[PDB]
Design a protein around this ligand. Structure first.
Ligand SMILES: [Hg+2]
Ligand SMILES: [Zn+2]
Length: 255
């Protein structure tokens, strides 16, 4: 499975038939169709005491992993019931600045999309969480190209180190709070992972307001490799999945 002409999103249904399920992600967020729900509580993000551990190129993206043995960095409130622990974050980028985001707003596509993955701790482990309709919580943030984001440089600088598939590097004392927008206004809907195994275990929380990163910042992402070290070089670009059918589902607005 990949993002190529032969193993891309259009072919995932063969190995993963849930690809054609009832609550697949991402979707298109119609701002006029979304429902302002007044019963929506504010998001509660506690990442003050977060412990970053490493960064790894898994062949489809780079993940920054966090120590989730304890309630260090948790997400609660909003549409959620209980606490979700951050386990990792990754991005989806395009080849150009006019594509990249997974989720669209009125069909508008961003240069990248940041996903912070959280798992419901009543289930005890990530493994068990991905077996529940309410197992995971994904915090989605759109990235636009403009001004440089000071808080993202640490990552940008380490990518030289995990060029190919399989490489990993120590990556401690990274504060995720640096990746957040000013506003916590969001959209929420029941969805899935946007990569195989496309499990329908996620409560998606997409923030209204984007963070801006510089062109030189996003450019470093495009220098990455899908391929493993010592194989034909395949640039890690367009590692996103097209929007899917909402199919009955309703998208709620916190604003
Ligand atoms: Hg599930
Ligand atoms: Zn993702």
């Amino acid at each position: 499975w990949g993002y190529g002409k032969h193993n891309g999103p259009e072919h995932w249904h063969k190995d993963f038939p849930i690809a054609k399920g009832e609550r697949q992600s991402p979707v298109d967020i119609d701002t006029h169709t979304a429902k302002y729900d007044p019963s929506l509580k504010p998001l509660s993000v506690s990442y003050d005491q977060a412990t970053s551990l490493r960064i790894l190129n898994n062949g489809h993206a780079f993940n920054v992993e966090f120590d989730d043995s304890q309630d260090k960095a948790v997400l609660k409130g909003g549409p959620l019931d209980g606490t979700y622990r951050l386990i990792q974050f990754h991005f989806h980028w395009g080849s150009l600045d006019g594509q990249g985001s997974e989720h669209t707003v009125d069909k508008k596509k961003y240069a990248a999309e940041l996903h912070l993955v959280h798992w419901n701790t009543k289930y005890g482990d990530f493994g068990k969480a991905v077996q529940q309709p309410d197992g995971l919580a994904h915090l989605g943030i759109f990235l636009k190209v403009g001004s440089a984001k000071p808080g993202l440089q640490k990552v940008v600088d380490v990518l030289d180190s995990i060029k190919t598939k399989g490489k990993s590097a120590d990556f401690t004392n990274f504060d995720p709070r640096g990746l957040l927008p000013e506003s916590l206004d969001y959209w929420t809907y029941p969805g899935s992972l946007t990569t195989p195994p496309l499990l329908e275990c996620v409560t998606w929380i997409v923030l209204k307001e984007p963070i801006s990163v510089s062109s030189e910042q996003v450019l470093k992402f495009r220098k990455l490799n899908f391929n493993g070290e010592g194989e034909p070089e395949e640039l890690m670009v367009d590692n996103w999945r097209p929007a899917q059918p909402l199919k009955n589902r309703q998208i709620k607005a916190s604003f």
